[PDB]
């Protein structure tokens, strides 16, 4: 046995253990555009209830047409980072429009929200500084923090008292600048960070407040500006990182939105911005069309909150443990990972497309289906899916 082939055996052993634990993820091959209804390669049409396509913009024909026109005017790829020959007029326009949309001075585009978080903390903070994360922060945030030299603190999920505890220990530890950072809306449980309280706590200690808005931008808040609008702290946020790949088009891209001087240091120093490709022209162009759509009417936002309020009441009535208000992320807890695999595959047989969340995506013993509402869903599909959840929820002992 050679070391290299030994290595491949440890990999194959690891892959076999993951199956045995029921934790192996199987990809489903979709044959159609993203949509509230979708078809797999077997030709079966099913209701998609697990997409980040909150506002239906992923296949919106005006967004689609703006991609066609940006290809015509501005080409397919740029094959360059921003500071060389990857900045088109489109990127500057989109950054201006996102900053106005979000209430910030400026905005810097990244290839993904993952890389915005990746290149944020190491650029702005040093060994003398502290970052203090909600314990449930998205993986991209944790890895961005791990790449920084900052001192790290974690506070219990949504626990404003533990947040005060950590800011005390961080100040005691001699922190110079302190950044409190959290998902605006949490990926896996739908809860909404208490930004109004956190803005107050931050001011008291003099800490910066940064949020990750991937699951808020476009629909949270009366005008879909984000969690900070819904919490009454619009214009009061130090750092917004976010994605173009959820409600704002779904294709690719991310951003950091902040005061002008923060954004300016990120262009000069942030590693993903210096060393990774610019957002593709058709993407930037369609994102500008997305902002025109959402600033013209809150209808899509309102429709989402409506469908959500409907489908949440529905799951309440059936005996599922869902709070039943608004929150387009409806986490249906099943704890056991094998149950989650069963429920996902039973619901697929009854014409509903959802997917099992289990470790390492969610913690062990806390498996779940993450149901995700879209503004696309019509009452027929909504009522249809409730029947599939009621039936499958009874066949497998959940209600």
Ligand X SMILES: Cc1ncc(COP(=O)(O)O)c(CNCC(=O)O)c1O
- Which residues contribute to the site for ligand X (CB under 6 A)? 52, 81, 84, 112-114, 117, 138, 140, 183, 187, 212, 214-215, 243, 245, 254, 275-277
Q: Does 10 bind a copy of itself (CB under 8 A)?
A: yes
Cβ atoms 329, 372 nearer than 8 A:
yes
Show Cβ contacts of residue 233 under 8 Å, excluding neighbours closer than 6 positions: 195, 196, 199
| Coil/strand/helix, residue 243 | strand
To ligand X, the closest distance from the beta carbon of 254 in angstroms equals 4
Contact status, residue 114 vs residue 246, Cβ threshold 8 Å: no
CB of 328 to a copy of itself, least distance (A): 12
Segment 119 to 178, residues that bind a copy of itself, using CB under 8 A: 124, 138-140, 143, 146-147, 176-178
Q: Which member of 36, 67, 198, 304 binds a copy of itself (CB under 8 A)?
A: 67
For residue 318, state whether it binds a copy of itself (rule: CB under 8 A).
no
Using CA atoms, how far apart are residues 224 and 186, in angstroms rounded to an integer?
16
Strand partners, 151: 130
Contacted by 212, from a copy of itself, ligand X, none: CB < 5 to 8 Å by type: ligand X
Shortest Å distance, C-beta 155 to a copy of itself: 18
Token pair 């296949």: residue:
59
Q: Is 33 in the site for a copy of itself (CB under 8 A)?
A: yes
Q: Which does 68 bind (CB under 5 to 8 A by kind): a copy of itself, ligand X, none?
A: a copy of itself
Residue 183 interacting entry, from a copy of itself, ligand X, none, C-beta within 5 to 8 Å by type: ligand X
- By DSSP bridging, strand 367-372 and strand 329-335 are antiparallel
Residue with tokens 């790290």: 152
Q: Which partner, a copy of itself, ligand X, none, binds residue 215 by CB below 5 to 8 Å per kind?
A: ligand X
- Residue 257 phi, psi (nearest 5): -120, 130
Distance CA 305, CA 54 (A): 10
- For residue 84, state whether it binds a copy of itself (rule: CB under 8 A): yes
Number of residues in contact with a copy of itself, rule: CB under 8 A? Answer: 113
Query: Closer CB to a copy of itself, residue 282 or residue 324?
Result: 282
Are 246 and 212 in contact by the 8 Å Cβ rule? The answer is no
């Amino acid at each position: 046995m050679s070391n290299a082939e030994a290595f491949y055996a440890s990999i194959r052993t690891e892959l076999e253990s993951i199956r045995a634990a029921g934790l192996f993820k199987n990809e489903r091959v979709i044959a159609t555009p993203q949509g509230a209804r979708v078809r797999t390669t077997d030709g079966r049409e099913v209701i998609n209830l697990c997409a980040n396509n909150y506002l239906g913009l992923s296949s919106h024909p005006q967004v689609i047409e703006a991609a066609h026109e940006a290809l015509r005017t501005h080409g397919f790829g740029l094959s360059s980072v921003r500071f060389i020959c990857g900045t088109q007029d489109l990127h500057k326009t989109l950054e201006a429009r996102l900053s106005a949309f979000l209430g910030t001075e400026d905005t810097i585009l990244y290839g993904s929200a993952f890389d915005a978080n990746g290149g944020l903390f190491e650029t702005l903070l040093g060994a003398e500084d502290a970052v203090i994360s909600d314990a449930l922060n998205h993986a991209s945030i944790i890895d961005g923090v791990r790449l920084s030299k900052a001192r790290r603190y974690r506070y219990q999920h949504n626990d404003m008292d533990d947040l005060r505890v950590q800011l005390e220990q961080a100040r005691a530890d001699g922190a110079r600048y302190t950044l409190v950072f959290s998902d605006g809306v949490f990926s896996m449980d739908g809860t909404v960070a208490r930004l109004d309280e956190m803005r107050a706590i931050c001011d008291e200690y003099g800490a910066l407040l940064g949020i990750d808005e991937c699951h808020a931008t476009g629909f949270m808040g009366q005008r879909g500006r984000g969690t900070h609008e819904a919490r009454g702290v619009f214009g009061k946020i130090d750092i917004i990182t976010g994605t173009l790949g959820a409600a704002l088009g779904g294709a690719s891209g991310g951003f950091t939105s902040a005061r002008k001087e923060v954004v300016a240091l990120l262009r000069q120093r942030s590693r993903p911005y210096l060393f990774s490709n610019t957002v593709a022209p058709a993407i930037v162009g369609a994102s500008i069309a997305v902002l025109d759509i959402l600033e013209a009417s809150t209808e899509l936002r309102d429709r989402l909150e409506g469908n959500t309020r409907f489908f949440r009441a529905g799951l309440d009535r059936l005996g599922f443990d869902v709070k039943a208000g608004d929150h387009p992320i409806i986490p249906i807890m099943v704890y056991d990972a094998d149950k989650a695999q069963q429920l996902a595959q039973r619901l697929l047989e009854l014409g509903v497309y959802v997917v099992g969340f289990f470790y390492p995506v969610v913690p062990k013993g806390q498996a779940r289906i993450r149901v995700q509402m879209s503004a696309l869903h019509d009452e027929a599909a909504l009522q249809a899916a409730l029947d599939a959840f009621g039936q499958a929820g009874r066949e497998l002992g959940l209600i």
